[PDB]
């Protein structure tokens, strides 16, 4: 019964390993999810520069 329990645990670990390999392959195929296989491109600096350029329109004067 100890070998039966260890075989059941190792078999379930094998199925979860195969399923996470499939999930990681489908995630790297499409680059969909935000955890792995995702390059975070941010426009924070573009919005900061646009806000600064909008702020310096008020500063234009004499």
């Amino acid at each position: 019964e100890k070998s039966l329990h260890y075989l059941y645990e190792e078999n379930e670990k094998a199925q979860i390993r195969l399923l996470e390999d499939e999930v990681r392959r489908k995630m790297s195929e499409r680059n969909d999810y935000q955890a792995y296989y995702y390059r975070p491109s941010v426009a924070k600096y573009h919005r900061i520069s646009k806000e600064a350029a909008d702020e310096l329109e008020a500063l234009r004067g004499d």
């Binding site: 645990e9 379930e12 670990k13 979860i16 390993r17 996470e20 680059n31 969909d32 999810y33 935000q34 955890a35 995702y38």
Partner: protein, 58 residues
């Protein structure tokens, strides 16, 4: 014509008018219904099933 000449900087200030023409449109936010979904902050985190699932571990 009985007209008064304005000051030196009368025409270089900001002009406020009551324009009859309606403003065209407010800048609407672009809708992206299928973005990249992250893990939410309200998502529960139970412990992992058989741990790390590495070689000889958990």
């Amino acid at each position: 014509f009985d007209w008064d000449r304005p000051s030196y900087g009368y025409f270089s200030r900001a002009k406020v008018i009551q324009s009859a023409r309606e403003a065209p449109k407010k800048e609407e936010k672009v809708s992206y219904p299928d973005a990249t979904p992250g893990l939410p902050e309200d998502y529960p985190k139970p412990p992992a099933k058989y741990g790390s699932r590495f070689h000889w571990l958990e």
